[PDB]
Amino acid sequence: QPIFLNVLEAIEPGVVCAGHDNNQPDSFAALLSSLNELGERQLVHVVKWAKALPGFRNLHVDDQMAVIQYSWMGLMVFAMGWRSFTNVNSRMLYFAPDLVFNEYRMHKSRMYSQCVRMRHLSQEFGWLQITPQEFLCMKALLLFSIIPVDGLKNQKFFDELRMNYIKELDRIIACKRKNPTSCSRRFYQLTKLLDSVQPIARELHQFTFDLLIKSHMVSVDFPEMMAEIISVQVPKILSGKVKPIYFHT
Ligand SMILES: CC(C)(C)n1nc(Cc2cccc(O)c2)c2c(N)ncnc21
Numbered sequence: 001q002p003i004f005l006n007v008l009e010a011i012e013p014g015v016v017c018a019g020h021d022n023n024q025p026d027s028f029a030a031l032l033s034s035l036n037e038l039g040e041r042q043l044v045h046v047v048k049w050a051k052a053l054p055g056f057r058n059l060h061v062d063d064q065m066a067v068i069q070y071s072w073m074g075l076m077v078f079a080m081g082w083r084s085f086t087n088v089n090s091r092m093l094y095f096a097p098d099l100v101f102n103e104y105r106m107h108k109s110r111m112y113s114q115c116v117r118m119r120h121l122s123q124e125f126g127w128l129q130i131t132p133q134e135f136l137c138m139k140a141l142l143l144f145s146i147i148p149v150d151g152l153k154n155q156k157f158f159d160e161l162r163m164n165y166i167k168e169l170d171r172i173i174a175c176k177r178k179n180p181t182s183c184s185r186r187f188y189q190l191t192k193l194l195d196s197v198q199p200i201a202r203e204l205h206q207f208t209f210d211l212l213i214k215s216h217m218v219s220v221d222f223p224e225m226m227a228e229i230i231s232v233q234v235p236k237i238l239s240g241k242v243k244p245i246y247f248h249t
């Protein structure tokens, strides 16, 4: 209740494994290769999930693939933080059931700092007392939070679509909340949270980019679709062509 919420919960992707071999020692090459595999795998669900979103088919076919290729990073990270929260209380990064990052692994991955921000983000879900309804609505809104500076194929359908999801976030906050002060307060809290995701995804973008460039030397494997999206789409973000949409300055 209402119809919007039923869809989000029903289309919510299921558990996904990275197929990591926890029988081998934690090496940079191994860990990163598994993450990319998880990325490729998680990419398949994100696409199916996206197309199953209410009104997603209102966007031009090109912008549909576009928004996905630009925000797939923010979506996966945001979802991961939630899992980590609803699994190990944010104690560790729960990327996948067969790929959990502890203090040690965070270091071995050569991206300790970035993992800290992710864990921090994961702790936000708890401190702010985020609910499943709010989580689902915020995650969907992340798909519509990054586009090229010059706009999309048909920007009108996107603005209207993005606006409607923001409206849903209101009805969610409004519903079951008898107070006009905590309402705006809540919107402020969440909108702030959604913004914190962008800076994090930005560092992961640059990190994955560099890794790809020097992937053969550090012996890190990049799946087909991962290698193309990171070498064709990501570059547009790090070049200033595609920038995220912030609520606050
Ligand atoms: C190949 C497939 C279907 C998994 N796919 N689809 C898309 C997006 C898309 C494009 C056109 C029509 C669609 O239904 C979906 C995509 C992407 N952006 N990056 C990598 N793989 C993608």
Ligand SMILES: C[C@]12CCC(=O)C[C@@H]1CC[C@@H]1[C@@H]2CC[C@]2(C)[C@@H](O)CC[C@@H]12
Pocket: 032, 035, 036, 038, 039, 042, 073, 076, 077, 080, 094, 095, 096, 204, 207, 208, 211
């Ligand atoms: C999105 C993924 C994989 C899906 C997920 O649960 C979040 C996690 C965040 C770090 C990403 C990883 C995919 C592979 C990347 C992009 C590595 O190349 C460097 C950062 C990794």
